[model samples]
Target chain A: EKYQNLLVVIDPNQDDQPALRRAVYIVQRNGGRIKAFLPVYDLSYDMTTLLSPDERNAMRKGVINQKTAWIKQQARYYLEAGIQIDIKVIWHNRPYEAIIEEVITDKHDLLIKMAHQHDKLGSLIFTPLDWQLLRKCPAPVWMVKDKEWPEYGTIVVAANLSNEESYHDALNLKLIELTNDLSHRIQKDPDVHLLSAYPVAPINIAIELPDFDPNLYNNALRGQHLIAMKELRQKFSIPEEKTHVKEGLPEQVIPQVCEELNAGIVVLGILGRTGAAFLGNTAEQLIDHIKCDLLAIKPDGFTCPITV
Target chain B: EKYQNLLVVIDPNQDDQPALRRAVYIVQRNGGRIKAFLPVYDLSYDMTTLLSPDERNAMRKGVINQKTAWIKQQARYYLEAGIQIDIKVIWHNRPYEAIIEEVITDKHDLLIKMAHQHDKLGSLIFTPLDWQLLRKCPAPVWMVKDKEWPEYGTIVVAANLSNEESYHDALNLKLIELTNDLSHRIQKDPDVHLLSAYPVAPINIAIELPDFDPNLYNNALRGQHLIAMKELRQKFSIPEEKTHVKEGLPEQVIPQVCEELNAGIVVLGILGRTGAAFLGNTAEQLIDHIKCDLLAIKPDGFTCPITV
Candidate 1:
């Protein structure tokens, strides 16, 4: 219900224009218009430096022109699908900045972007824009993982049952609803699962953690857990039977929950602004541990504002 | 260095086999042995009453056979690949317990698994096995993303700069080495980005927090920030230019950092279990929010028998 005007972002380099096309089609079917914002921020730092002064100037101009062309193409593409949209081309040092500002200024409830492209060179210096948006953008950021046209199978809400309220979740919800609505658009059923993870450390001695009193820590953690379950069940209106609360750390716990429930697309949350500071630890755990496509929502004011 | 022998657990389902093969291949390349465990647990919840008895039995048999055969096939495949492996098929009510016991008995250095895949009919949530392993496993855990290689182009270390000494940077450094090594194996270049994202709420409501004084919070923030930055820079000798410090919630900030950095992999510590009955809500939030591949290392006890 939160995402009425869905804005979809497409990566121009990728071959999957059809995926974006299908996404726009679904949006239009759901009574939403597509506002196409495409930014081709160069990922290779060395590539940027490789450009000589003249090369850099020429490349920058080309990039700006490409951005504009991409925006227009996407807009026209949507129009062909019988959907109208506002098209924009952004040239910024940072693409995420443009996204954050646009999401906030335009009050766009949902933002869709293709999953980041892995570098063929295997450079460790690469940064993932998807993770960045997840951490900070208030709008729901749906990162389509599949190159095939997106087909909604199940919309999984990565619900943290703890009493903690996440601004991140507010954005993630839009993705769930969008997917659910899109499933209906594609003539598919919407399956929603509310999942929570429990992180449990073994109790015996000669175990992994010796510095902290595992026994005492486990006990306190157990007490605090009900807060999440109670709060999550109430907030999401999840049936007690359908709501799952498991134990483990986030990286382990969330994926475990997803696995147990067989989640297809995970609807998750990220704090906006300074998004990078907070997520470094837990986010890494989930990325390494969890499988499946992730839909991340960024909370407000966590990044530079966006307007498209 | 701690994990010389890494074990990978996998599902017997054919769909999950691709992930398993990739995992085993990576471990072999790393000079780590692979130990695969597959569990077959019967769900006798009597949901069959809804379906005809014959239909129910067929469904049950199909699931059991699939689970068992998949393990056998995987074991054979590993053997053929010339990868040293110890494979086990267990019929247990709780797969988590079995996974933990295997890790302890084998003393595996790291555990890898294909996170559960979700379907529409009954989506799987987080697997309890992985969560327990994350919390109690003797070694670090890597949760594999589907069709994504274990190697990282950019490795992001998520640490709490607030607690420098206590923050698990050594493990983070180890990950950088491992990732760089992985990049070498994958023939890809690896860049390591150390990002420290602080929560703004603490600094924002400095006056409202208990024992709060504007000067004190500012001093603490500055002091903690300095400690984290200095420690990481000195220990890892990461250039000051490469390290980043931002303010925001963990769920949003970490991913944002990763996106900006184009990080292929992320690593962070899971606070040791508080033996309390409840889970840490903060940890849960990050679990759902993070995008891309992730690795979780439990805080190691400084003092312990090296053998244990």
Candidate 2:
């Protein structure tokens, strides 16, 4: 219903028991129950060229049957974990969209899943569904790369002080709170740091007004910025010593700050739904550049908790 | 003036004499002229330091001296190119801002300059001036990347159709027309693809189907989606085949399309100054992700004509 509920999406095509165990441990440690949602078939395999429609249908039917069996085994783990779960089998052309819809409608705030890499002809036209979910899903989507309870390092917040200046401030607080919550469940210490960056705008003195002086303006802006950051620190419970503000573009500044701070994971708030474009911009820019893990969270109104 | 007249922004600190030579080739090939703007002193260095009252005055004086020196040098190039060159160096603090103002106030329609990646830390941090100029300045910015005398490839026009669909598409269309026309002049086949990328929104399963029967939601949603897409295709005359409706995030899909199509260059419109925080949402992400040569086109509303 709340943080007590969890959603786990597994690929029927791959042996995902290791991934499933990791998800279960995460949920159990976080005081949450697990709901394992299994796809009846691996849509990732494009069988558009099987020559005969009948053969393709037969292959698809067999894959579906195999997947159903995998689901039952995964369900047994849920029972053994002594966790309460609700299950649902969804049929959709796009598995990514269907899983995301479950997250939004079912009120499942957290999702534990695996990451994938695209290959071949599909590579040219490929879109990794995991990345898509990160961009669009509003709920906290945790992508597990290893089969262990994450030694979640320091939680880093990439705060864009321009548009969602206010929203980012709220996120800085919520991010630490969430990380602390996770740390408390696991009985470990995970540091939290807030990063704020500002880009400098060049001033053209010749094109300026008669009384304009760029040096003066730059100093004034910097001073005002420092004061604003100080206020955010207090509001977010960030010790005056821990918060940092870098000056540059987000794509450059966020990653640069993360590297400098040695963060293990980034906590960001997706403004909209999974498969929607909201998470497309900044997150996309950070994809290859980010060296640490990413913990994606969404706003309240945009996210739905689904039944799985 | 015409396509023949090119403007090269010369950084005197670096022996960019080769840049001027390349510019000459472009002007001669296009039957245009060359107008060069050079900065004698590095403005980036001066922007960061703390200066005393006397030292500040001295820096201002130095700026004036540098402007005079660079303008005279540029004038000599104009004389050699046998082109009408209007060279003036302004004592401005921001080099990028000065260049944009010059392009506008001088009535220059197309801005041709070598798109050098900023190497200095401060240069990279400050406004990413070139990218900003691309978004805000109305002029068609031609950032020369290759010295192949002329550029021969398709000009990819990035269009935003999902949200504000064409509220500003006309301006971008004009940009595409101009860019394509220029590319065609230089290269063999200059095809323009109006690309509309849709970022993934988070999963809002409940909002999408608050009252619809849970069992039939998938088919119904897809049915509505097909009808909507059909209308879009019919109205736009986007080849029913080429009008793609794929599920995934926009940034990834765009680059995937580019790589799959083997595009030589990418052209995209800036979201103007208003598109700040979601900067990446607008153009920042595209700019970063684009693997090939890129041209950042300013919106029509943001530019002014520059004259000698």
Candidate 3:
């Protein structure tokens, strides 16, 4: 019941739609409707100056018509399975903008898209598109890896308990609540874990402040983190053994813990504006290390950067 | 053996070594030595204009030594598995430059790295690193997908028989020979398929040239392509059924055929200067649809873009 209307972002370039398959898998069990969304546009078709304005408009509509037909052809294959997926094609240049607009227009409960990730290139960017979607999309965003979810592996809920702010705690609670909903939807009695990474004392600070004992600062920070972790774990009823408090940046510690647990998905919060200095402040770096599927949640009343 | 010296590029950020394993598999069966290569650097260590010049130099050397040690520690894990892999760590800003330098210095026969591909973002860049390596690296490049080679997938050899030039034909021959080598290395009997996609008459050409019969031109062009394909197939001793002459762009046709065949890998040629107007000219598009592993081969005497 949590994800009533799911938006599955489709990649036109790729014939295999893992995102569609993943969204369908969820909706089948969760009783939800699925919309396959594709932001389709060709620069040649858009920027090309034809003989007249009427001709240009005709060309634009022609491109849309072709893509709509193309997408419907793809959908008809899946339609044979008795599951009807609503298809949306927007002739927008920027995919992120189109996706967010669609999400807002249709009131999508979940935004699920394929995270065009490849480990083979040895280097992958968290592309501007994924970043924008995570930062601006109002609905909880699920960036699915190309592969199907593994039967085994912990569903990790990552929290930045470094900040003692009230909103931060609320965001953490929201993330955990979403994780609980996801866990039940995924399977019965899914293994859930908590991870909070704390940074070591800054190099400049250690160098400038003679009184700044690196070890002492680390211990103090570590102590607060463990206690915060315990408080959150007790609130969510996650066992002590299933929780982790590590010393490193979000990128380093999160990936390391995810690896240790062979995490199926990592639930993280995307904070806007009042961006915390420690965790997720460097949102790019935070996502750069994420190799597993990701579910990004935003706090209540958080505004998207995009507008109608 | 065609490949007697192999360079296995390692990603320090990741724990998995699919590239290393792939290289080892090749070397084990083909009797070659594998060098595990890593380009390591940290902005903090590199740009820290410390107290003195000597201190800065020391810091640079410190970073190199540290990375060398780190890479070695990773290799030592495989050392326990009874594989002795030589390790190389270059402290360089551009990974492609470092990799090419090592290839020239060591005269490596093949360069194998992971293609950081994920189907999740629905947006994956062919990365500047991958593009540079494919365009400039003298050795044949193997970009492995994260997963292991499937037992029943075809090893597709893609060619552009659109051109009637001598060098283009030679490049195609080189690609097929390399495919033969790869097939034997992979298994005693491997499914090898050929795909050549020819674009239909250009839209502008058809519109501008009133005399240009689109179907007539298509027939002529397609006939030339099939003849060229048949000639190449005869030379390679491949059956007519295994050869494909499709009508579309490289990105569209190549990937379409690969998916239909469940391709494990696609072998393609990377042309440097004198880049043809058609096929692989837009190298980015050529690779955009590639979901399977890729092997990019450069023509003989093709110069590396990087210089000492």
Candidate 4:
């Protein structure tokens, strides 16, 4: 809801109905225009297959036309309902590249895409395309899952209170801001919770150094995180009950708390590959444990590692 | 040189002479004990290629014994030179994991490994083992490339002056301190350069927002970096000429500066994956571009994402 201009990335293969509907709803709530972008390319033929220039161009155009028509048809619901929306279909071998290019060129505030839910084995299957977008895209990405938010929903804002490097602090503040903005835009009194996780140093430290007190070490660490969380809560005017400072690996703590709170969505910060080490596989791991939608916010001035 | 207890990881297949020599040199300068760790496994035999229990155990024992003897023979130079050193060989499938385990168990302050030089295409040919150590090892990793530093050499310390984040400022100070300490340890007057890179925001911003002036924005950005650099230089007692605040992507600018200066070693601060958006692939890309040895340091409270 905090996004200004939304970029709706529609899967050309799948229905993408859920993504489109969610984008429309977001735009409606935020009062912004939508760009329904679809990247289509025929993967049926082998790369070695050669075609005449005219035939290749025609085939590309045909695919673009078909995708454009389908996107327009899908977006018709929003357009007919008086939402400002436009459809653009690009023929590209890599959908993520095209979507990223369009996002940058059009200066979209947010990128919305549909991701399949995790399997029964608790493994979240993300395609290379999804990973590329998550890792490299500068704009905030709202990954909508199959499930919908309940009437009185909760949004869990997970922040790394221990990491003082990079833009983690700024990203945390932005997460709280976005959560607050979205809560106000939605129904009355949606449950909003702020969570931070800090890991206790392994016992090997105490084992290696006889005089090193693990209790003192862990207590100091906990005190630091608690102080950070308290400051954050005061800054955001969040109630003490709504703030949580847990000691454990974030990948485990975040989801457990979210499920305990029955969160409809988790607003997590996604630093570029160079920025924060946590957002790499840690983000992917957290996704596996949660059944809710994820709104990944990038720090301001975040530049993707991939130069493209 | 600041590290007291060093763990030298040597590849059994390769000569690994350079790594051992470097570790010896470090111990000689720092006046510390060394642990030469070798992780040996039989890659020729498959898991299903089962022999008798005694035969399998003997095979593993033979590999460990051979590796241990080789390591002891390699360390003879240091031991005869009156340096304190020990050799230990472990049977493990993965070398990096074993090295990391030993580092934690023994409480080593530094981990040194030799990395192969990059090929003609400008790619550092690091095995998966090297990357895991770089990414997950808690202690500082000294990746000694093939090249050797000349007397009175230069050490470039890269910092993110643009980031006002808490750890970034602390890391910048730590980088300068280590550079100074190592400079005194190595030679009388080894040149120490403090480098920072700031990327110019795309001109598209000015085009989109008519009120935005590119020159004004650039000047402001440049001034901020210059001021920060000046403060850092003053705080570290670094000369003005030795401090550089360039304008470009850090991945590109850092290597260019290193090459321009013929830096013998580059001291870099690495944050946890969740900490910063810089130094992810930027570190790898910079390594690819430079021929110097890399000393990667972590922040005070950095915990490796990977669990033992």
Candidate 5:
């Protein structure tokens, strides 16, 4: 589905909204609408020094009022086009819930945010909020880089063929379909690479087991991924060169492949099947690792469970 | 500084404690001492439902008591061999933090640990704690492989020369200085290869600023690094073709060069990324990606922020 009416989680530090701009770039191309969202809170608002409830809320509303205008300021380009932008700015103790609160009601098809990324000084890190949205937000999440798209960058779809279970196999087809759709939408016959990574064993299993044969098992796993990748590639008609079956943790392989390709975007799956709808370890790690923009998608029937 | 009183971060995954053996190997040859340390704690111990603070304290202490014996038992071979190796086990939430604290309190000059190597499962993978140790521990750390050094392998030392910041420049000098000093002590005139990773501008900055010519700016950055690296090469007496300054990241680029050369051991300088004196981001990334044994060292002037 072409996600329309996106919710932009504005970056607090930079005055510019890289998130909003990318959202519009997608929304405009896809004939989708737009909305602007901000989650704000002052932890000191809970301090005993605050005079009264009235003053406390005034302080809260003042900040919201401040950013409500700021959200509109960012959406000015889209709003002038009469795209029906909803400025959902509010102060809340829990931030990710507030972002999801709007999506729960509004049916916003996409959630976009600037990937709070590697600082030259601090290196790359993702916030707990950035993670929560990945795990909890039902809508498709597109974490955009602040950089402009590469002139001839490739698009990578991490085809997870690790499991043959009907559950994951469905997901494989779904990610490929979405990747192809987005590739065509974004650029003409883009260099879309499909990657399938298989693991020999979990770190513990290989080391712990006395009879673990690495090369044989590694070869078998790689063969399996290749078999699945071969089938998927032919069905999707992906070129042989663009289809890769690598033997490593998908966590390492996906990021490494994207880095080598100078890829613009990598399609990843963030299935909401977690009990807390929390991200899976692989997905959580991918949020931190990949250099390219992550277009994280959910498989069919995946749902965001957070309530207002 | 003379290397002695080496600290081994006992790998929790296996009892062989390849690290302990490696520690003893170095100590026996170079006349050094060993302290085997393990940081033990249980998450369930923190559950109020499971145990109260005092009860949790006892439980954690009990684990230390158990592991303390285990470390000595593991070190018994070296101990019986007439080497005075100490066993230091303590209760800490994090393994690396505890190890660094021991180093801070005691006088461990070299930090030794098993390279949590390619488990035949995926590949060379460092745990979150291992990464933190690489970042935080101020002492020189060696992640050893259990196997003997290969017949025809080079010693790859990655010395990043991207940042001209005094701290970075100082670190570049320190990295090679240690690499050179380390080679002759352990082996016959070693095949040492020096690696450096330079960067294009921040991806966004390059894309956004009209004046930011990726070619010209990249050329200047690379050209600047070439000059510094050349001076670094000759000043350190690294031969031609022995030094490399490739682009991309210290994390990805360093490993590719190492693997290409079939590196046996690589020296890496661990600088704090930010105002904090934890391992720099690049070094942390460099750790997991490299397949060979790693010798991780803090910069010359770095002092561990941890205090007893």
Candidate 6:
């Protein structure tokens, strides 16, 4: 119930009813208005060449009229359910920039968008648009899939405890706090889990270094992460059985653990260049593999590169 | 050789002279001043808590003095060779921000940093600092490995001819141009190859859709890419035999082709959110698998997120 003024990005290329439904569900719970934002671009026309004012106006009007009808048709159910809704469309070459700009200008607290789910792999295939929103969006991005959020499903908060350099500790704390807050409102006694992964020095490291013991180094690294993870979990009041400390790449381990736990959503933090934890490299990897919904949170003071 | 000002980041924690040597070699050919930037931080001291100004100054001065000597010692070889070198040490907790800020403020055309090469797998292990530079740095990032760039070795320029969005075509063109530019200056006519990968729709997609033919769809997709690749190769004046059009994910295909070709370096393009081609999810995966020097180029309008 924390979010208000939801910005819902509609993908005209796909049947994204699920995204709209998720936005409505959130707005209903939070008692806020929803803005259906659509940024349309026609690649059929060469953007480099200038069109006549009449031609440009005609094209814009045509797109707006078409999308407006489509949006009204989709929003009928939610509007009839007594929820306030607004639909807007703008012509832009890059949808991500426009979507983010709308979020900023409108002061939206959250963004909801649907990612096409890969049926065979049971994972979501994110387009470049989705990647932009995930990385640069000022607000939290809730990427919903075709799969529904199950009742009493687990919510996994993937965190990092090994790195103190990149403000990972603060992000880990924020992830837990957001997860707890969302779980309290979204489900009836939903199970919450905290996950952290640490990498062990490979065997070849010992072979290369004369006096470096691989086992000692690996054990020491693992021990430090375990202690830190224990402290973080205890501070968040998460139980021992509910916290997972594993040894592997976070990208591989996080998704594996989420699937094993049947997590409905994995709330993770993404920081910009200054405070990027495990998000920069590993976040993209997780996006393609995680079957559950993804809620990407940005650290405080994160400014989106988009200026529009 | 085209780079005028080079910024080299030295990892204070690891022996990174190999990376510095590579940069020096490039500077020797290209004629540029090298700025050795070291950002030092102490995990022992909590930065969030208040510290006496004297205590902070003492801590900062101690680290700068230690690293200044270390950087000067490392720069002796380049200085003796008559290459202009400057040493700088900053008391910043986040190295990537400090590094990028230096790049922007100083207008460094190229950033050369060494990543630790894993022993068993000759791949470089990129830290959070490396990822930040790769994704957000406005200048070209030359991620040098411990391995040397052999004489008359192949330089593989990976291009995506499949997607035209995000100025990928422009990036693909730029990759080959830069490869040619560098090859002419450094090696005695090194081999340059262009590669593109097209993904086949999953088997389940054909099953779910009654009219969908996997083979036909795959061939059509491959045909489009092959046509595009041929056109781009011809435009770049690349030999037909040196062009590679494979059917697989770029992450898998690019590395396989690089290994088979024994490429000395792989030049790739990484666009920001607005112009991201195939670099979003697949770039990091390819980073760990490619056993050669990686040169990542940004798009035309990429502004580094580091403002400080």
Give the best candidate by lDDT: 6
Proportion of true inter-chain contacts also present in candidate 4 = 0.00
lDDT of 2 by residue, A1-308 (tens): 23677788775546655446655666676666767775443221222332134433444455555555667766776776586655555434445667777776777768877643232111111124565566566678876543233354566776544432355456545665676577556545657777766544344453324555657755654665577668767765678777777666565677667766766667666565332232233445454355555677765555433324
Name the 10 consecutive residues with the lowest summed lDDT in model 2 chain B.
B118-127
Give lDDT for model 6: 0.73
What is each candidate's DockQ, to 2 decimals? 0.02, 0.04, 0.03, 0.01, 0.02, 0.04
lDDT per residue (tens digit) for residues A29-96 in model 3 = 77777898887543223222312344334445656666777777777766777676888777666677
Residue B220 CA displacement from its true place in model 1, Å: 4.5
What TM-score does each of the candidates earn? 0.43, 0.46, 0.54, 0.51, 0.51, 0.54
Q: Please, what are the lDDT tens digits per residue for candidate 5 over residues B212-252?
A: 33355457657776888789879888887888879875667
Order the candidates by lDDT, highest first: 6, 3, 4, 5, 1, 2
lDDT of 6 by residue, A160-267 (tens): 665556567777787788778866775567698888776653233222235544466457657777898789778988899998888886777888899888888898
Candidate 4 residues lying further than 4 Å off, grouped into runs, are: A1-308, B43-49, B118-124, B204-208, B275-279
lDDT of 5 by residue, A19-99 (tens): 888867776666666677777753224422422354345456656767788777777877888666677777665566778
Q: What does candidate 1's lDDT look like per residue over A1-308, in tens digits? A: 33457777666555455335646755655666667776543211112332234433444455666567656654664576676676677655456666778778888766776553233211111124554566567766666554342344555676533323345355445434555555556455566766655444322332233444435534544555556556655665556776565666666677666655656567666553331222433454465454555666544434544444
Q: Is candidate 4 or candidate 6 better by TM-score?
A: 6
Scanning candidate 5 chain B in windows of ten residues, the lowest lDDT window is: B201-210
lDDT of 4 at A128: 44
* Ten-residue stretch with the least lDDT total in model 4 chain A: A43-52
Q: Model 2, A135: alpha-carbon shift in Å?
A: 4.0
Number of the candidate with higher DockQ, 5 or 6: 6
Instruction: Show model 6 residue runs off by greater than 4 Å.
Output: A43-50, A204-212, A274-279, B1-308
Q: On a 0 to 1 DockQ scale, where is model 5?
A: 0.02
Q: What shift in Å separates residue A157 of candidate 1 from its native position after superposition?
A: 22
